């Protein structure tokens, strides 16, 4: 959900890697400096807290 | 992809900056050369006056 929601907030100009730590994922989302908020916006949309 | 914005990124700072170095490099060639100009152009009106002078000197002497 996050990915696809990531992607249309996001585009194809970046990189979305995680590893596992004991249960899900920690993960990690790199953008460009200046589309952080629309990041931001796509996790606060979902539920996720950082 | 994220890599392809990268790359456009520095080619566009490292043109910038050695337009701007060639722009000292213009400029101090030529406030150099004005200055090499001056600096004769001093030398001429020196000789003049040290030669209208020293005439003078010698014509109200003799």
Redesign the interface.
């Given at each position: 959900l996050v990915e696809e929601a990531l992607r249309k907030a996001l585009e194809?100009?970046?990189?979305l890697a995680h590893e596992a730590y004991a249960g899900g994922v920690p993960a990690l989302v790199?953008?460009?400096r200046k589309e952080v908020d629309q990041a931001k916006a796509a996790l606060s949309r979902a539920g996720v807290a950082e | 992809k994220l890599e392809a914005i990268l790359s456009q990124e520095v080619e566009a700072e490292i043109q910038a900056l050695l337009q701007e170095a060639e722009a000292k490099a213009e400029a101090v060639k030529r406030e150099a050369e004005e200055k090499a100009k001056a600096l004769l152009q001093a030398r001429e009106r020196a000789l003049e006056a040290q030669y209208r002078a020293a005439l003078r000197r010698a014509e109200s002497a003799g």
């Open positions: 194809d100009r970046y990189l790199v953008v460009h | -």
